[PDB]
C-alpha cells in the first residue's frame, strides 16, 4: 500500500532535482544567449559601418574611373590634334625644302640674268664708241661698186632674207621649247605634290594595316578568352551538377526528417490510446515478415493501410479526429472495429495453383486477421513477371496480383513496377557545411558567368570596330588605287612631253646648223664686200659708218631690243624674287602658326599628364584604402561567421534544454498528478 506512495515520493524528488538542474542550465543558456545577442548587435553595427565605408570607397572609385574615361576621350582628341599638327609640320618641312630649292634656282637665274645684262651693257658701250666733196667722190665710188657687184649685192640681200626667215623660225622653235619647258616645270611641281600625297597615303595605309593586324590579334585573344570562359563554364556546370547531387543528399536528409515527423504522429496516436480505450496501433508490427520471401511485397500492396491505425468505434475515430483538430497533431487513417463487419465472411480457400496466399504469410489474432483479410481482399503473390503474366493475362479475372519482387497489376489493370536500393544516410550538420560550400560555388559561378557575358559584349564591340576598320581599309585601298592611276597618268604625260621636247630640240639642231651655214655665207659675202671697198680705196682716203643711217642704226636698234629683253628678264627675275619672298612670308606665317600649335599641344599634353598623374595617385590611394577596408571586412565577416556558428550552437543547446524541461514537466504532470491521485484513492479507501 504505502510502498507505491514511497516510490512516487522518491520519483518526485528525483524529478525535482532534475528540474532544478535543468533550470540552472536554462538560466546559464539564457545568459549566454543574451551575451551572444549583444555581440551580434555589435557585429552588425560594425558591419553596417564597414558597408558604408565600402560604399563611399566604391563611389569614389567609380568617380575616378569616370574621370579617367573622360580622360580617354580628351586624350583621343589630343592625339588627333597632335596628328594633325604633325601632318602640318611635315607639310611645312616639305614646303620649306621645295621653296628653298626654288629660291636657289631663282637666285642662280637672277645672277645669270644680271651677268648677261652687264655683258650686254659692256658690249653696247664698246660699240657706242662723209662730207660734201667726199659725197661727190662717193657718188662715183658707189656707182662703180654697184656696176661691179650688183650680183653680189643681190645675193647678199637674198642671204639676208633667208637669214631673217631662219631667225623667225628659230624664235618660233625657241618659244615652243620654252612653252614645253614651262609645262614640264608645272608637271614636275604637280608630280612632287602628288608624290607627297602618295607618300602620306602610303604611311596612312601602313598605319591602318598595323592597326588592323593589332585589332585582329586582339580579336583572336578575345575569342580565345571567350572559348576558355565557355570551357570553364562547362566545367563549372559539371561541378554544379555534382553539387546538385550534394543538394539531393541534403533533400534526402530532409526526407529523413519528414519520416521522423511521421514517427511523431504515431506516439501521438499512442497518447490517444492511453487516453482512449481499446486501440490497437499501427499495422507494421502486426504482420509476419520472417522467411525473407515476398516480405516487402505485401507491404507494397498494403501500403495505404500499412500506415493506418485500428480503433474501436467509428465514433471514437471522429472524436480522435476532433482531438487532432483541437491540438494540431496531424493526419492519419482509422479503421474502427464497429465497421469492419462489412466483409468478414470472405474466408474462402479456392484453388491457388500451388501459390502462396497473402493471409497464409501473416501472424495474427482473430480481429487482426479479420482486419488484414478485409484490407488485402484478393491479394495474391507470384514468383516471376512471366509467371504473373501467364496467370493473369491468360485468365478473364482481374485483381490485385503482385510479383515477388514488387511488380503489380491493379484491380483496374494498372501494370506497375519499381524497386529502390535504399542508402540510410545522416550527417545533416556536415551537409550544412556542404550546402554552404555549394552555395558559395554557385555564387562564384554566377559571377564568372556575368564576367563572361561582359567579355562577350566587349568582343561584339571589338568585332564591330574591326568591321569598321575593314571598311576604312577598303576605302583607303580605293584611294591608293586612284592615286596610283593619277601618278601613272602624270608619268605618261611627262614622258610624252619629254619626247616632244626631244623632237623639237632635234629640229632646233637642224635650224641652228642652217643658221650657221647662212652666217658663213654672209661672212663670205662680207669678205667680198670688204675686198670691193679696199679696191675702191685706191681713189678714196667711213662707208660702213656713213650708212649708219641704215647699218649701225639697225645694229643699235637691235642692241636696244636686246637690252629691253634683258630688262624684261631682270623684271622676271625680280618677279620670281617677289614670289620667293611671298612664299617665305607664307612660310613664316606657317612657322608662327606651327609654333603656336606646338605650344598649345605642349600645354594640352602637360595638362593631360597632370590629370593622369592625379588620377593615378587618387586611384592608388583609393585602392590602398579599399584593400585595407576589404581586409577589415573579411576579418569582420570571419568574426560574424564565428558568432553565427556560436549562436546556432547556443540555439541548439537551448532547444535541447527546452525539450528536456518539457519532458520533465510532462513527467511531473504525469507523476505529481499521479501522486495526488494515489493520495486521493488512499483517502477514499480510509473512508471505509
Amino acid at each position: 500500500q504505502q510502498k507505491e506512495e514511497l516510490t512516487d515520493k522518491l520519483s518526485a524528488l528525483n524529478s525535482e532535482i532534475s528540474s532544478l538542474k535543468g533550470k540552472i542550465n536554462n538560466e546559464m543558456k539564457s545568459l549566454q544567449r543574451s551575451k551572444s545577442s549583444f555581440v551580434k548587435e555589435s557585429a552588425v553595427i560594425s558591419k553596417q559601418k564597414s558597408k558604408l565605408d565600402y560604399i563611399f570607397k566604391d563611389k569614389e572609385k567609380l568617380v575616378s574611373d569616370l574621370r579617367l574615361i573622360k580622360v580617354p576621350q580628351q586624350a583621343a582628341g589630343k592625339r588627333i590634334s597632335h596628328i594633325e599638327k604633325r601632318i602640318e609640320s611635315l607639310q611645312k618641312d616639305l614646303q620649306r625644302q621645295k621653296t628653298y630649292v626654288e629660291r636657289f634656282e631663282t637666285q642662280l637665274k637672277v645672277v645669270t640674268r644680271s651677268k648677261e645684262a652687264f655683258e650686254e651693257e659692256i658690249k653696247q658701250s664698246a660699240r657706242n664708241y662723209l662730207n660734201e666733196n667726199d659725197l661727190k667722190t662717193y657718188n662715183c665710188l658707189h656707182e662703180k661698186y654697184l656696176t661691179e657687184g650688183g650680183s653680189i649685192l643681190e645675193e647678199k640681200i637674198a642671204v639676208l632674207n633667208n637669214d631673217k626667215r631662219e631667225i623667225q623660225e628659230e624664235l618660233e622653235r625657241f618659244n615652243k621649247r620654252a612653252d614645253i619647258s614651262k609645262r614640264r616645270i608645272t608637271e614636275e611641281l604637280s608630280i612632287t605634290g602628288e608624290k607627297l600625297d602618295t607618300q602620306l597615303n602610303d604611311l596612312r595605309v601602313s598605319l591602318n594595316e598595323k592597326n588592323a593586324l593589332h585589332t585582329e590579334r586582339l580579336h583572336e585573344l578575345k575569342k580565345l578568352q571567350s572559348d576558355i570562359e565557355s570551357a570553364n563554364n562547362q566545367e563549372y556546370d559539371l561541378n554544379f551538377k555534382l553539387r546538385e547531387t550534394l543538394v539531393k543528399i541534403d533533400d534526402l536528409s530532409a526526407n529523413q526528417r519528414e519520416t521522423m515527423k511521421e514517427r511523431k504522429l504515431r506516439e501521438n496516436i499512442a497518447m490517444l490510446k492511453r487516453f482512449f480505450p481499446g486501440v490497437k496501433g499501427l499495422v507494421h508490427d502486426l504482420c509476419h515478415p520472417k522467411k525473407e520471401k515476398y516480405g516487402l511485397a505485401v507491404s507494397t500492396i498494403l501500403g495505404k493501410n500499412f500506415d493506418s491505425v485500428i480503433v474501436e468505434n467509428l465514433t471514437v475515430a471522429q472524436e480522435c479526429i476532433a482531438f487532432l483538430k483541437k491540438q494540431r497533431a496531424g493526419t492519419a487513417s482509422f479503421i474502427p472495429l464497429d465497421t469492419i463487419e462489412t466483409e468478414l465472411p470472405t474466408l474462402s480457400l479456392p484453388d491457388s495453383q500451388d501459390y502462396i496466399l497473402s493471409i497464409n504469410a501473416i501472424d495474427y489474432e482473430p480481429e487482426y486477421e479479420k482486419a488484414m483479410q478485409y484490407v488485402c481482399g484478393d491479394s495474391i503473390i507470384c514468383n516471376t513477371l512471366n509467371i504473373a503474366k501467364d496467370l493473369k493475362w491468360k485468365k478473364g479475372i482481374r485483381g490485385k496480383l503482385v510479383t515477388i519482387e514488387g511488380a503489380l497489376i491493379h484491380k483496374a489493370g494498372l501494370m506497375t513496377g519499381g524497386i529502390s536500393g535504399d542508402a540510410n544516410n545522416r550527417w545533416d550538420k556536415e551537409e550544412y557545411q556542404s550546402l554552404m560550400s555549394l552555395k558559395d560555388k554557385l555564387l562564384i559561378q554566377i559571377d564568372e558567368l556575368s564576367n563572361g557575358q561582359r567579355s562577350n559584349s566587349i568582343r561584339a564591340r571589338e568585332v564591330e570596330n574591326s568591321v569598321s576598320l575593314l571598311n576604312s581599309d577598303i576605302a583607303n585601298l580605293r584611294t591608293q588605287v586612284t592615286q596610283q592611276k593619277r601618278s601613272l597618268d602624270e608619268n605618261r604625260l611627262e614622258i610624252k612631253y619629254h619626247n616632244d621636247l626631244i623632237e623639237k630640240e632635234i629640229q632646233p639642231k637642224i635650224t641652228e646648223l642652217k643658221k650657221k651655214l647662212d652666217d658663213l655665207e654672209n661672212t663670205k659675202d662680207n669678205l667680198v664686200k670688204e675686198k670691193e671697198a679696199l679696191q675702191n680705196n685706191i681713189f678714196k682716203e667711213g662707208f660702213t659708218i656713213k650708212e649708219y643711217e641704215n647699218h649701225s642704226g639697225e645694229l643699235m636698234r637691235q642692241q636696244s631690243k636686246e637690252l629691253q629683253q634683258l630688262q624684261k628678264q631682270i623684271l622676271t627675275v625680280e618677279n620670281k624674287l617677289q614670289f620667293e619672298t611671298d612664299r617665305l612670308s607664307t612660310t613664316q606665317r606657317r612657322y608662327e602658326k606651327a609654333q603656336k600649335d606646338l605650344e598649345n599641344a605642349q600645354v594640352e599634353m602637360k595638362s593631360l599628364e597632370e590629370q593622369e598623374y592625379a588620377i593615378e595617385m587618387k586611384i592608388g590611394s583609393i585602392e590602398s584604402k579599399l584593400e585595407e577596408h576589404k581586409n577589415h571586412l573579411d576579418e569582420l565577416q570571419k568574426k560574424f561567421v564565428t558568432k553565427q556558428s556560436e549562436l546556432n550552437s547556443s540555439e541548439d543547446i537551448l532547444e535541447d534544454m527546452n525539450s528536456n524541461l518539457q519532458v520533465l514537466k510532462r513527467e511531473r504532470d504525469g507523476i505529481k498528478e499521479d501522486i495526488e491521485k494515489f493520495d486521493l484513492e488512499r483517502v477514499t479507501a480510509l473512508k471505509n
Partner: protein, 708 residues
C-alpha cells in the same frame, strides 16, 4: 449511504466546468488561429514578394548595368560629337581667319593690279599711238628700202646694153620659174587643201571628245551614297537588335534558373521512392523509342480543378497525381524491363491500347436532397479523350457537407466520400481525416509554374531564331552594300580611265592641230608671198618685154635713176629719224609696259590660286556649317534621351531599394509576431492537454466510484 452519489455529481459538475473552460480556451485558440493564419498568409505573400524582389534585384540590376553602360556610351558619343563640333568650329574659325587675311592680301594685290592696268590703259593710249606710227614707218621702209633695192636692181639691169634680146630668156624665167611657182602653188593647193582636210578632221575629233566630256557619274555617286546610308541604317538596326537579343537571353537565363529552382522545390516534397521513379522513367523516355509521344506525363498537368475544392482533389488524389498514361501496354512493359538495374522506386503506367474495366457510373444527382452533394467531375477541366482513366481516379469521389450523411450515402451507394474541409471517407468502410496545414500538393500549383517556364523557354528559342535571322539578314545587307560599293568604285574607275585616255588624246590632238594650224598659217603667208612675187614679175619682166617688144638709150631711164637715188637718200634720212624716235619711245614706254605685264603674270597666277582656294574654302565652310548644325541637333536629341533614360533608371533603382528595405522590415516584424503566436499556441495546447488528462482521470475515478 448516498455521499458517494453526491461526490459523483460533484465530479460531473467539475467535468462540465472543465468542458466549459475547454470551450472558452478553444474559442481563444480559434481567434489566435485566425490571427496566425492571417499572419502565415501575409508571411507567404511577403516571402514570395521578397523572392521576386531578389530575382528582380539580380536581373534588373544586370539590366540597369547594361542601361547605364548604354547611357555612358551615348554620353561618350555625344562628347565625341561635341569634340567634332569644336574641331569643325576651329576649322571654320581658321578658314575665316584665312579668308580675312588672304582677302586683305587679295584686295591689296587687286588694287596694285588695277593701278597697273589703268596705267597700262593710259600706256596703250600711248602705245597704240606709238604703234600706228611705227607700223606706218615700217611699211614705208618696206615700200622704200625694199623699193630702193628694187630700183637699184632695175638700174643695174638697165645698165647692160646690147645693140643686137635677152628679155626672151628672162621671159622663160618669167614663164618657167613662175610655172615652178605655179607648181609651188600646186604644193599650196596640195597643202592648203591638205591643211583644210586636217582642220576638218581635228574639228571632228574635238567634237567627239567634247561629246564624251559631258551625268551618269553623278547618278552613280548618288546611288552609292544612298546605298551607304541604307547600310548605315541597317547596321544601327542590327546593333539595336543585338542589344535586344542580349537582354532577352539574359532574362531567359534568369527565368530558366528560376524554373530549375521551382522544380527542385517541387521535387523536395515527393517521396524519393517515386521521385527516383520519375527521374528514371524520364531518362528512359529520352533514351528509347518514344517517337509516338506515348508518354503523357503525370496526372496533374493533364487536368485542372476549380480552386474552391482544390484541396479535396489533392487529398483524394495523393499518389494518383503521378499516374502516367501510355498508348500501348507493350511499351510500358518494355520500359519497366529496361529498368534492369532499377535505381528508382514506385512508377505506374496505364495503357490506352487495352484501357478497360472503366465500368459505367450513373450519378443519382437527379433526385432531391443532393444539393449538399457535388459531383467532382463537374469541376474539372481535362482532355475528353482520357475520360475513363480520369473517371477511374476522380469519378466516384463525391463531395459531402456532413460526414454522417457521407457515410449514409456510401452505404447506400458505393462511392468515396469527402468533405469540403477534407474529411476523406472510404467506400469500403475505412475512414480518413486530419488537420492540414497550408502546405499541399504543390506539384499542381507548380505545374502552372513549369508550364510558364516552358512557354518562356519557347519564347526565348523563338527570339534566338529571330535574332539569328536578323544577323543573317544584316550580314547579307553588309555584303550587298560592300558589293555595290565595289561595283560603283570599279565603274567610276573605268569611267575615269576612259576620260583620262580621252583627255590625253584630246591634248595630244590639240597640240597636233595647233601645229597644223601654225603650218597652215605659214603656208598661207608663203602663198601670199608667192602671189606677190608673181604680180611683181608680171609687172616688171612682163612690162619690160611688152615695152621693149615695140634703142639702147636711157634718157628717161637716167632721169628715173637719178630720181631713185634722190629718193633713196631721202628714205635713208627719214628711216634714220624714224628709227631714232621709235627707239626713244620704246625705251621710254615699252620697258615699263613689259615690266607691268611680267608683274601681272605672276600676280595673275597668284590671284587665280587665291580665288580657287577661296572658292574651295567657301564650299567647305558651307558644308561644315550644315554638318555642324545637323550634329548639334543630333547631339541635343541624344543628350535629352540619355538624361531621360538615366532619370528613369535612377528612379527605378531607388524604388526597388525602398521596396526591398520595406519588405525586409515587414518580414522581420512578421517573423517576430509569428514566433510570439507560436509560443502562445504552444502554451494553450499544453494547457488543453493538461485539462484533457485531468478530465480523463476524473472520468476514471467517477467510473470506479459508480462501480460500487
Amino acid at each position: 449511504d448516498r455521499e458517494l452519489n453526491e461526490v459523483i455529481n460533484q465530479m460531473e459538475r467539475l467535468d462540465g466546468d472543465y468542458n466549459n473552460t475547454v470551450y472558452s480556451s478553444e474559442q481563444y485558440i480559434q481567434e489566435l488561429d485566425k490571427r496566425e493564419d492571417m499572419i502565415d498568409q501575409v508571411s507567404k505573400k511577403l516571402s514570395s514578394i521578397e523572392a521576386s524582389l531578389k530575382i528582380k534585384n539580380a536581373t534588373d540590376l544586370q539590366q540597369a548595368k547594361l542601361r547605364e553602360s548604354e547611357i555612358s556610351q551615348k554620353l561618350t558619343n555625344v562628347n565625341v560629337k561635341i569634340k567634332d563640333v569644336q574641331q569643325q568650329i576651329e576649322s571654320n574659325e581658321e578658314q575665316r581667319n584665312l579668308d580675312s587675311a588672304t582677302l586683305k592680301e587679295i584686295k591689296s594685290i587687286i588694287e596694285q593690279r588695277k593701278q597697273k592696268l589703268s596705267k597700262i590703259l593710259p600706256r596703250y593710249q600711248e602705245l597704240t599711238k606709238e604703234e600706228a606710227m611705227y607700223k606706218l614707218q615700217l611699211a614705208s621702209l618696206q615700200q622704200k628700202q625694199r623699193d630702193l633695192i628694187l630700183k637699184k636692181g632695175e638700174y643695174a639691169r638697165f645698165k647692160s646694153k646690147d645693140e643686137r634680146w635677152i628679155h626672151s630668156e628672162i621671159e622663160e624665167l618669167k614663164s618657167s620659174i613662175q610655172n615652178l611657182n605655179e607648181l609651188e602653188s600646186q604644193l599650196q593647193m596640195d597643202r592648203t587643201s591638205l591643211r583644210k582636210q586636217y582642220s576638218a578632221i581635228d574639228e571632228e575629233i574635238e567634237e567627239l571628245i567634247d561629246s564624251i566630256n559631258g551625268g551618269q557619274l553623278e547618278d552613280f555617286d548618288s546611288e552609292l551614297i544612298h546605298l551607304k546610308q541604307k547600310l548605315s541604317e541597317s547596321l544601327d538596326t542590327r546593333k539595336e537588335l543585338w542589344r535586344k537579343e542580349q537582354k532577352l537571353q539574359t532574362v531567359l537565363e534568369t527565368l530558366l534558373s528560376d524554373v530549375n529552382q521551382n522544380q527542385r522545390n517541387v521535387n523536395e516534397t515527393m517521396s524519393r521512392s517515386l521521385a527516383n521513379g520519375i527521374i528514371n522513367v524520364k531518362e528512359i523516355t529520352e533514351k528509347l523509342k518514344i517517337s509516338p509521344e506515348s508518354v503523357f506525363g503525370t496526372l496533374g498537368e493533364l487536368i485542372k480543378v476549380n480552386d474552391k475544392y482544390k484541396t479535396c482533389a489533392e487529398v483524394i488524389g495523393g499518389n494518383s497525381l503521378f499516374h502516367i498514361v501510355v498508348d500501348t501496354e507493350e511499351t510500358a512493359t518494355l520500359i519497366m524491363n529496361e529498368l534492369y538495374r532499377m535505381k528508382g522506386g514506385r512508377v505506374t503506367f496505364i495503357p490506352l491500347n487495352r484501357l478497360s474495366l472503366d465500368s459505367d457510373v450513373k450519378f443519382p444527382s437527379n433526385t432531391t436532397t443532393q444539393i449538399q452533394f457535388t459531383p467532382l467531375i463537374k469541376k474539372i477541366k481535362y482532355e475528353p479523350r482520357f475520360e475513363k482513366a480520369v473517371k477511374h481516379v476522380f469519378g466516384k469521389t463525391i463531395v459531402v457537407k456532413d460526414l454522417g450523411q457521407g457515410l449514409k450515402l456510401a452505404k447506400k451507394h458505393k462511392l468515396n466520400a469527402i468533405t469540403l474541409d477534407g474529411d476523406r471517407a472510404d467506400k469500403r468502410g475505412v475512414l480518413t481525416g486530419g488537420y492540414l496545414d497550408q502546405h499541399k500538393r504543390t506539384r499542381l500549383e507548380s505545374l502552372k509554374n513549369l508550364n510558364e517556364s516552358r512557354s518562356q523557354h519557347k519564347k526565348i528559342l523563338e527570339e534566338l531564331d529571330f535574332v539569328r535571322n536578323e544577323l543573317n539578314d544584316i550580314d547579307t545587307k553588309i555584303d550587298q552594300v560592300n558589293g555595290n560599293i565595289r561595283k560603283v568604285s570599279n565603274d567610276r574607275e573605268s569611267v575615269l580611265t576612259n576620260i583620262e585616255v580621252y583627255r590625253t588624246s584630246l591634248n595630244t590632238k590639240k597640240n597636233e592641230k595647233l601645229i597644223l594650224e601654225e603650218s597652215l598659217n605659214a603656208i598661207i603667208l608663203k602663198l601670199e608671198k608667192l602671189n606677190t612675187n608673181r604680180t611683181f614679175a608680171q609687172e616688171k619682166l612682163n612690162t619690160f618685154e611688152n615695152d621693149l617688144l615695140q634703142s639702147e638709150l636711157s634718157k628717161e631711164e637716167k632721169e628715173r635713176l637719178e630720181s631713185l637715188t634722190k629718193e633713196i637718200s631721202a628714205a635713208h634720212n627719214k628711216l634714220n629719224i624714224t628709227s631714232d624716235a621709235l627707239e626713244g619711245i620704246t625705251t621710254t614706254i615699252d620697258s615699263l609696259n613689259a615690266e607691268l605685264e611680267s608683274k601681272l603674270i605672276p600676280q595673275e597666277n597668284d590671284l587665280e590660286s587665291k580665288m580657287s582656294e577661296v572658292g574651295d574654302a567657301f564650299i567647305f565652310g558651307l558644308q561644315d556649317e550644315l554638318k555642324e548644325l545637323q550634329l548639334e541637333k543630333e547631339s541635343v536629341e541624344k543628350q535629352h534621351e540619355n538624361a531621360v533614360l538615366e532619370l528613369g533608371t535612377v528612379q527605378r533603382e531607388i524604388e526597388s531599394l525602398i521596396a526591398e528595405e520595406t519588405n525586409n522590415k515587414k518580414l522581420l516584424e512578421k517573423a517576430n509576431n509569428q514566433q510570439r503566436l507560436l509560443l502562445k499556441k504552444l502554451d494553450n495546447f499544453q494547457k488543453s492537454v493538461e485539462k484533457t488528462m485531468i478530465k480523463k482521470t476524473t472520468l476514471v475515478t467517477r467510473r470506479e466510484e459508480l462501480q460500487q
